[PDB]
Amino acid sequence: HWGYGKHNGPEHWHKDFPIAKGERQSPVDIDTHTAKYDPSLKPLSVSYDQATSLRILNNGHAFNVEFDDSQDKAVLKGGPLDGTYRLIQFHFHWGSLDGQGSEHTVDKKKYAAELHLVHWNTKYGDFGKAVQQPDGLAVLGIFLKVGSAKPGLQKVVDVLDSIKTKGKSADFTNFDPRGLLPESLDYWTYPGSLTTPPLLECVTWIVLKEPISVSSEQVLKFRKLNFNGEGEPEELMVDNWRPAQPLKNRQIKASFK
Ligand SMILES: NS(=O)(=O)c1c(F)c(F)c2c(c1F)N(CC1CCCCCCC1)CCS2(=O)=O
Ligand SMILES: [Zn+2]
């Protein structure tokens, strides 16, 4: 029953998930002036050359591209991380309008969408164990602005009509997530949470400074998806973002000056 509506949206989630009011919730606004450059932060190591995509799923929240995570095929290392984190899936959040849709904001600026590449710390053995740990996940967040198309996004765009409604999936092999990355891997980082229920406080967030551009047509195709299942009243899948949460007793670090 949680969702993004008037009667079941972010404002309501604390009743079923009291951690919603916790000490390390995400997303947050990234105040670029008060983020501290940390010269000890390492470059991010994104190793996606052996990624094995399997499937794309509409789970009633977003669309989700899932990978084989039963071996170290696509991993994230370095940056603020001390472990080796395996890619399990990516998904997006987006708006009804080009001027909203991101979860994180930058100096209060909202982007049209935000890509989340989810990785789990291999020292915990499975994803289900990892989400129970304060250093279980590392989510790489990438902003999307509307402008020129992103060619490496088009294969995703093109399959969306085959997963229009909740519970639909489609085979999605040989997708290369390197086509979704910007030129720079400069980043901000802070400790936070899942941005959807169950809102677990298990995530090291790494948000890239440089957005990617996508076209107005690419994001318009995201907005054709449905929150509902087939045979139910149509509800367009838009505005599936949680707003910025209190930073509380946290410092956002920058890898760059
Ligand atoms: N936004 S976020 O990056 O913090 C985030 C996340 F970190 C995740 F790990 C997952 C998310 C999710 F958003 N989702 C959304 C799911 C999470 C809970 C299970 C199924 C219900 C829909 C929402 C995809 C599955 S998931 O891979 O478990
Ligand atoms: Zn997300």
Main features:
257 residues, mainly beta, Carbonic Anhydrase II, 13-stranded mixed sheet, two-stranded parallel ribbon, 15 strands, binds the ligand NS(=O)(=O)c1c(F)c(F)c2c(c1F)N(CC1CCCCCCC1)CCS2(=O)=O, binds zinc ion, lyase, drug design, carbonic anhydrase, benzenesulfonamide, monomeric
Q: How would you sum up this structure, described in words?
A:
The modification Phosphoserine is found at residues 162, 169. GO terms for molecular function: arylesterase activity; carbonate dehydratase activity; cyanamide hydratase activity; zinc ion binding. Substrate binds at residues 195-196. Interacts with SLC4A4. Interaction with SLC4A7 regulates SLC4A7 transporter activity. Interacts with SLC26A6 isoform 4 (via C-terminus cytoplasmic domain). It is a single chain. The chain is mainly beta and 257 residues long. It has a single domain (1-257), classed as Carbonic Anhydrase II, CATH 3.10.200. Helices cover 8% and strands 29% of the residues. Strands 2, 3, 4, 5, 6, 7, 9, 10, 11, 12, 13, 14 and 15 form a 13-stranded mixed sheet that branches. Strands 1-8 form a two-stranded parallel sheet. Strand 6 and strand 7 form a beta hairpin. It is globular, with a radius of gyration of 17 Å. The termini are far apart. It binds ligand A1IDN and zinc ion. Zinc ion (ZN) binds next to strand 7.
